[PDB]
Amino acid sequence: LFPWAQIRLPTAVVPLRYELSLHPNLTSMTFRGSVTISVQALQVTWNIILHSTGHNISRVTFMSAVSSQEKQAEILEYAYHGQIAIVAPEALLAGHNYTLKIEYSANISSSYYGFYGFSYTDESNEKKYFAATQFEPLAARSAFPCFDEPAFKATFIIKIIRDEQYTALSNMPKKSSVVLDDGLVQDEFSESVKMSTYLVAFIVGEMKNLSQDVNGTLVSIYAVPEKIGQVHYALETTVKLLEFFQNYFEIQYPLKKLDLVAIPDFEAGAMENWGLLTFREETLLYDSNTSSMADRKLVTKIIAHELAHQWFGNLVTMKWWNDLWLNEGFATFMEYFSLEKIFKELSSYEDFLDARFKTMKKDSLNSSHPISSSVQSSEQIEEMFDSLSYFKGSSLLLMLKTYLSEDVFQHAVVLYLHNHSYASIQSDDLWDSFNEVTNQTLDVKRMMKTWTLQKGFPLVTVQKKGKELFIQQERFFLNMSDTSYLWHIPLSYVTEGRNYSKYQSVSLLDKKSGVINLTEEVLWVKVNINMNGYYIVHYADDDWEALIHQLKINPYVLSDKDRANLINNIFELAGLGKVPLKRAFDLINYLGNENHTAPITEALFQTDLIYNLLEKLGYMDLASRLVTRVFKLLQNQIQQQTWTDEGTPSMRELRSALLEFACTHNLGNCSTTAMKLFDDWMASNGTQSLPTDVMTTVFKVGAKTDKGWSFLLGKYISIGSEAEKNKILEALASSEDVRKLYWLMKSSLNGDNFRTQKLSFIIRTVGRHFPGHLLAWDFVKENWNKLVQKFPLGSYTIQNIVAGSTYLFSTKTHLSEVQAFFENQSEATFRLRCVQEALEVIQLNIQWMEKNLKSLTWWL
Ligand SMILES: *[C@@H]1O[C@H](CO)[C@@H](O[C@@H]2O[C@H](CO)[C@@H](O)[C@H](O)[C@H]2NC(C)=O)[C@H](O)[C@H]1NC(C)=O
Numbered sequence: 122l123f124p125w126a127q128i129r130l131p132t133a134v135v136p137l138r139y140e141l142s143l144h145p146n147l148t149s150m151t152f153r154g155s156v157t158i159s160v161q162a163l164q165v166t167w168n169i170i171l172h173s174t175g176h177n178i179s180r181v182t183f184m185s186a187v188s189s190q191e192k193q194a195e196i197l198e199y200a201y202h203g204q205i206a207i208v209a210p211e212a213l214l215a216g217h218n219y220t221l222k223i224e225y226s227a228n229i230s231s232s233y234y235g236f237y238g239f240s241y242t243d244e245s246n247e248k249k250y251f252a253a254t255q256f257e258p259l260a261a262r263s264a265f266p267c268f269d270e271p272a273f274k275a276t277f278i279i280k281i282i283r284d285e286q287y288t289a290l291s292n293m294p295k296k297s298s299v300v301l302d303d304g305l306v307q308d309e310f311s312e313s314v315k316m317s318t319y320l321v322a323f324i325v326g327e328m329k330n331l332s333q334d335v336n337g338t339l340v341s342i343y344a345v346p347e348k349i350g351q352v353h354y355a356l357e358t359t360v361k362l363l364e365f366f367q368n369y370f371e372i373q374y375p376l377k378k379l380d381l382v383a384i385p386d387f388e389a390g391a392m393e394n395w396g397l398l399t400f401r402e403e404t405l406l407y408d409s410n411t412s413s414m415a416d417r418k419l420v421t422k423i424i425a426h427e428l429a430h431q432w433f434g435n436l437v438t439m440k441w442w443n444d445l446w447l448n449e450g451f452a453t454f455m456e457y458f459s460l461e462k463i464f465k466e467l468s469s470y471e472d473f474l475d476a477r478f479k480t481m482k483k484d485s486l487n488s489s490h491p492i493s494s495s496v497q498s499s500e501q502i503e504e505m506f507d508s509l510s511y512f513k514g515s516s517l518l519l520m521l522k523t524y525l526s527e528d529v530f531q532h533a534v535v536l537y538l539h540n541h542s543y544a545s546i547q548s549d550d551l552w553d554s555f556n557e558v559t560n561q562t563l564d565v566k567r568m569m570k571t572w573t574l575q576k577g578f579p580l581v582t583v584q585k586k587g588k589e590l591f592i593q594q595e596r597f598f599l600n601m602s603d604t605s606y607l608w609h610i611p612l613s614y615v616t617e618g619r620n621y622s623k624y625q626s627v628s629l630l631d632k633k634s635g636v637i638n639l640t641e642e643v644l645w646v647k648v649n650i651n652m653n654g655y656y657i658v659h660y661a662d663d664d665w666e667a668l669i670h671q672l673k674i675n676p677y678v679l680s681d682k683d684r685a686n687l688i689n690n691i692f693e694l695a696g697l698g699k700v701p702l703k704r705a706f707d708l709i710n711y712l713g714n715e716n717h718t719a720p721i722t723e724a725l726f727q728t729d730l731i732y733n734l735l736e737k738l739g740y741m742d743l744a745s746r747l748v749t750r751v752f753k754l755l756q757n758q759i760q761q762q763t764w765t766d767e768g769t770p771s772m773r774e775l776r777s778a779l780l781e782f783a784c785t786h787n788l789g790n791c792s793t794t795a796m797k798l799f800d801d802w803m804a805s806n807g808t809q810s811l812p813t814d815v816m817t818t819v820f821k822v823g824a825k826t827d828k829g830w831s832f833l834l835g836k837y838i839s840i841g842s843e844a845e846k847n848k849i850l851e852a853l854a855s856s857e858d859v860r861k862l863y864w865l866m867k868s869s870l871n872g873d874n875f876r877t878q879k880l881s882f883i884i885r886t887v888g889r890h891f892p893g894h895l896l897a898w899d900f901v902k903e904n905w906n907k908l909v910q911k912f913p914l915g916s917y918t919i920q921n922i923v924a925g926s927t928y929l930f931s932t933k934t935h936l937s938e939v940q941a942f943f944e945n946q947s948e949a950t951f952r953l954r955c956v957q958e959a960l961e962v963i964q965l966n967i968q969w970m971e972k973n974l975k976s977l978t979w980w981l
Pocket residue numbers: 144145146147148149282283284285305
């Protein structure tokens with residue numbers, strides 16, 4: 122029986138370095154194992170308890186200091202926690218380095234987790250092989266026996282003997298390689314800096330490269346040869362972002378090398394590794410001419426994310442997974458924070474803003490879970506990998522860093538960085554580096570533990586009565602009894618009174634009610650500047666009709682982030698009931714004079730949730746009258762859009778937003794303009810450039826014709842550009858021919874012309890529009906069994922198939938059906954977070970109709 126009945130390893134033994142030698146042949150999917158672990162005892166144990174899985178071990182056994190002579194112990198194992206224990210020939214006395222050596226058999230993974238391998242086809246013919254690693258969170262132990270926790274850091278020599286052609290890559294630069302007798306090469310890499318078991322990485326496959334030397338460290342993007350041509354932007358961007366993390370962290374990237382790799386597969390594990398960043402082929406390949414704003418915006422942030430992860434996560438790692446949200450939260454913040462100081466032209470705050478919106482309305486559900494609390498098993502380690510925690514974390518740092526200065530934020534960041542580099546940490550340690558705020562401690566970061574420890578976010582009510590600012594707080598709950606919900610809240614607020622002179626100020630509300638005194642007597646006040654604070658603000662009734670009046674006068678007295686914030690808020694409140702729906706729509710009656718994208722898209726987002734909810738109920742006429750009045754507010758901006766790619770990113774994303782609003786709903790010249798552009802494009806065997814900005818729109822309109830449908834289907838199964846094939850798939854699923862809509866899903870499910878990864882994106886698209894709406898949900902239930910086979914229950918795709926099939930229902934008849942269907946298979950499924958959040962969204966719609974179907978009749 123085995124000497125350790127816990128899931129965490131013992132504090133008994135500690136690794137100091139790892140030495141690893143491996144023979145995978147990619148052709149037969151098998152490999153050599155050999156690990157030498159230079160450990161060290163800190164307390165007496167008869168065993169070394171450590172992690173190992175899937176290893177068929179031949180010979181293993183144990184040294185001391187003292188002797189280069191080695192002596193035979195035998196392994197005991199325990200597969201339930203992945204652990205193995207070596208029964209030591211003699212007592213590990215405290216303070217002594219011993220070294221441990223393991224030989225093993227193993228299989229190369231055929232999933233895409235751990236040490237995995239796959240095949241792909243060439244431009245010229247050919248069957249190529251390839252293998253890589255993906256060790257988060259607990260996968261390293263599958264490749265090689267080790268202390269697989271993030272606290273147990275160490276140093277690494279990895280050496281991999283690989284056939285002549287393949288380029289072997291790994292963390293540290295390749296020190297040496299030496300020809301072996303059969304035709305095989307032996308690659309050895311430098312010993313690694315101190316780093317965590319999960320960050321180890323190594324690649325075997327036929328690539329080329331493209332390099333540049335920022336200062337001392339040299340940056341290179343590795344891709345399969347085909348077109349290493351288009352890693353040119355990736356390369357140039359890693360470069361400026363590299364000496365953008367730079368100086369700001371005031372720490373220098375410790376490695377001599379930094380290599381990014383475009384792995385040639387769609388299920389590629391893309392991750393953080395030090396000196397060996399992975400990506401899916403798709404997310405890196407970019408082309409100045411044929412590729413849109415979306416895929417630059419996306420490739421720029423994807424780089425900027427895994428780059429800050431260098432400092433955050435690798436350099437300074439978690440004690441344990443209970444704090445993952447911190448790094449991924451911080452990285453996600455940097456991703457949006459670097460960009461708007463190097464690439465201020467992308468308007469990457471807009472992405473950010475909307476990202477925060479969608480964060481809050483799922484942080485407002487009751488399915489929500491506060492981001493920090495004890496983890497103890499691994500369904501609890503991978504439950505932490507939902508990007509809701511990441512984005513919320515991200516939101517907190519922007520709120521923390523605009524309350525404290527950006528400078529104050531920086532040094533406390535920098536001060537955080539220096540104090541425990543190469544070390545493991547817990548959450549509160551960052552809050553302490555901050556409490557070296559001020560000359561040294563003027564307020565505590567007990568503040569941040571109110572946000573971390575409680576689900577949801579405060580609703581801040583503001584009333585104002587001639588002197589004043591009466592500020593009160595409660596949890597934003599979506600209705601039908603606990604109150605130790607209290608937040609420490611930075612209250613940015615901006616006003617205007619006297620002379621058109623904008624006064625803005627900060628103040629931290631740390632009790633249930635409070636009050637701030639303004640200097641002048643204003644006509645309007647706005648709370649939460651640029652939505653810097655993660656919360657919703659509700660006003661008393663002629664404080665709301667102050668701002669709206671003010672928006673019809675001169676709205677540009679506010680930012681576009683503020684304006685977008687009111688539109689967000691006023692609509693979500695009128696959902697919760699705290700405002701009539703008709704004063705949301707009088708807020709956006711402003712929009713005749715709007716020119717910034719951020720508020721227009723957010724209003725268009727809102728109005729079209731309303732459009733679709735109505736449309737799925739029978740109330741089609743109400744729905745249609747709704748959009749045409751949005752259309753009329755935005756009528757000039759719509760026509761003045763040119764069907765082009767010309768302009769600032771912001772004004773391009775606006776252009777693409779306005780143009781397929783007007784087209785989705787057939788409003789004005791727009792559908793025709795588009796359908797000429799489609800015939801020209803289709804005339805030309807595809808051989809004509811569509812402005813990528815109007816490309817998804819042009820495709821939709823054409824997908825509405827059996828001629829057009831069948832063309833675009835040929836272009837899907839033929840053309841190479843995976844970017845444009847999702848704007849084609851989209852269209853194919855924006856048909857209203859039900860038989861096709863079914864056949865798309867039926868086929869994506871069977872992996873026929875569309876790989877099964879895309880079905881979740883198909884299903885969401887079919888069901889979102891009236892003709893497919895019931896068809897989607899029925900597909901989801903008619904093949905539920907085969908849906909659980911290829912997406913493991915609770916995974917982020919069975920996620921969406923239920924979210925995106927059902928989130929539009931609004932009748933208690935439907936509600937019953939959804940719940941009757943899910944309980945009717947399993948109760949273990951029936952109380953999945955995904956499933957009763959699915960159910961939770963549906964009554965919120967019923968509630969929404971119950972309060973706002975309304976009287977849509979007397980207006981609208
Ligand atoms: C995996 O096993 C195969 C088969 O033993 C090894 O194969 C050879 O591949 C080279 C080219 O890469 C050919 O020139 C040889 O003729 C092949 N030999 C045979 C017997 O098929 C392969 O090298 C092994 N992989 C590794 C990494 O050692």
